[PDB]
Symmetry: C7
Subunit: 151 residues, 7 copies
């Protein structure tokens, strides 16, 4: 019963975090000396908020399914977390590949952005597993409720 309010709050945390990420990216892109670096940090910030919106949408999808079937919601949440993790790995590999292809003069700035981007990946991964763990935590109660019902 308390899941649905938790899911709404979790989306607020994600949306607020995404606003901070783009604010920081805009600050770095405000006066970056390299136009190529300006696009890179802007794309990294745009990629970060895009996956954050996808994570919020995935959480909302699980919440929508929670009102009909709890077993299906857990499966849907697990599928959404796996899809989010795979997409997060996709952008990390592209960012790492771009950083390796960057020139040594710009690679110093690109690696710092890559480290900041890696922090965003870690924050997204930590939030996803924590939300998934809480989501499956109620499944313990859902299965226990079924066990109590048959008693």
């Amino acid at each position: 019963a308390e899941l649905r309010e938790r899911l709404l709050r979790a989306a607020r945390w994600i949306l607020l975090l995404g606003l901070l990420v783009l604010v920081g990216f805009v600050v770095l892109a405000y006066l970056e000396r390299s136009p190529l670096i300006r696009a890179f940090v802007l794309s990294a910030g745009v990629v970060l908020v895009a996956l954050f919106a996808a994570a919020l949408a995935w959480l909302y999808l699980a919440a929508a399914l929670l009102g009909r079937s709890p077993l299906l919601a857990l499966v849907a949440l697990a599928l959404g977390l796996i899809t989010l993790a795979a997409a997060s790995a996709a952008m990390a590999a592209t960012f790492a590949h771009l950083l390796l292809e960057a020139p040594p003069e710009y690679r110093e700035a690109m690696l710092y952005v890559f480290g900041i981007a890696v922090l965003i990946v870690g924050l997204l991964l930590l939030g996803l597993v924590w939300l998934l763990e809480e989501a499956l935590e109620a499944l313990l109660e859902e299965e226990k409720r079924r066990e109590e019902e048959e008693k």
Copy 2:
């Protein structure tokens, strides 16, 4: 009940915004000194309106499902928003990669187009989450109506 009219209006905002985006792109491509830049800004404008049409189609798909099942519509809207966000990230990465590969002489103009394109991504992302938030806002009423019905 007020969702369906809201969805129709939201499509009008998207279509009107897409017309402005292509109008601005046509102005920049009207007399651009570099033929390669002409294709780049035209493709960026064509990409922007293409995703805008996809976002409008995704909103209409959720509206169509809203007339049958509200829970399915919310799931469909969340899936459409995630698909739109993933596609938006795809074009942003391609645009950023092209900007990094652009020559320094053209990179100054390419980065300005990239910044304009990034603004379109931000506008699309902001509109998608706002529309999704309003769409799930009625789900609060939909669940409350079910709770009131069982009372």
Copy 3:
């Protein structure tokens, strides 16, 4: 009731437009000085008619579903429009990438073909949204008919 005849006419417009596009492409490829340019304009014309046939097939698929369920037809039409828009963006990005990779001597001719190709993309996009808008316009009547039926 008037949708099905409209869909048949819309396919005739698309097929007639595709014939004009390939006729113009054949005229440019008839005596182009560069063999590489000959393949490029021919491929661009072949790509344009291919998506036009796909758009006509997508419209026919919606018309076929219109005879069974109107809600499903609108969803299918929206899905087909999104798929057509995504495919149209795919060829535009490839054409833009090829134009940027073209040599400066040929880039002048390639950019003109790219601009012509961009016009085909705009014509296809404008036709798709107009057809989709008319298709969902009947959904207003379909929902109104259901509302009148329950009265």
Copy 4:
């Protein structure tokens, strides 16, 4: 009732056309001066017959579904035509990209093969839309028969 015989004949036209295409490709590859050109024309001929077999298989799939549901057959035929068109565009883009990457000495021969390949694409596209138009032509009779049945 006359569709099924038409589909069988249409496959015979496609198979006979594919035999002519590979016969012409074998003639050009019989004594081509460039071993790279020999592989290119052979692959182009192999690609042409491969899609021709796929088009024949797609037509047979629609014929198989025609014996159970006419509405499903039209949808399946439209889906098969779209898939064939997308695959045809895929090989055209690859052939065009290879032609642009060919050396100027071989590009003269490669462009002639590209033009011949483009003719095969046009023949396949024209046959697919003509077969699809005939397939949906019976849908007019199928819907009219249902209208006559309810009268």
Copy 5:
């Protein structure tokens, strides 16, 4: 009734043909002067037998479905043939691309292997369409049996 025995025999022809293909590839790779050529001919032979096994598996899948529904088996066989043709085109394009990228000294040997590989593609394509034609040939009897049953 005679289909199932035919399918078993057809797999035996494919497996026997695959053994001959790898035997010939092993003979060429036994004493090839170029280590790069050794990997290329081995991969081409490995690719040929891999698709041959896939074709045999696709034929067995149609045979398995033949014991339950004949209409579904024909659709499954058509889908398997299309998938096999698409995969066969995929390896042909990769082999052709590798041959074009081969050095002129090795391209003479690579083109001969490409021609041998093209023969394997033709043999696989000819066998697939012949097996599919026989498979749909019984569909004529299956539909005729239904027509005779209703008489």
Copy 6:
């Protein structure tokens, strides 16, 4: 009955292992002399934990399905293991390709990270097959219970 507790413990092992992997990666990235190497080891550590989270999510998905159908859970677990193995191979090939493309000066450090990454792949593969073997081990009991039930 003891599966569900085993699945919860297995996730704890995976999450604890992932924390150790990122801790080791952070130690190597804390003072790496090459900024490109810093991104590479960070991406490798981020990739390792991402697949570990996916493996934990896949295990939880099988546990969720275990409460409804045991046969479906085994199929879902097998599908999840195959998907995890395919994704693990994807990152291994990318890491191996990047290591081969690394310069000889950095390749010495890159190969050591590749060997460490290969150990993570082996640990993930060993854990996945061991968890799958235990999961199918209960299927022996599930089938035996059905056999005992019919007795």
Copy 7:
């Protein structure tokens, strides 16, 4: 009835074979003079065991479906074999492409690893078709049992 025990034994053969493959790969990577070669042989061994685990999982999936429907199990086994063959071809093409891109000094060692990898592909292909042939062999008994039942 004897299939299920055969499937369990077949997995034991695959797992034991995979252990031998990685043991041999570890021996070659223990003292390889080239760090790039060390990653290549390790990745090839990791790829080999990964597909072996996938093949074992595919066999277990067919065994799980064998307890419910024999016709579905044969279709699932055929689909799994086709997927395994396609994935096996994917790694073979990547390995062959990497071998061709290897420098001549390392290509001698890379080709030997490629030949060893090709042997693993042949062993996997031979085991898959043999297991599939045995799996469909019981389908002969399954269909014969149905024929005997109706007698």
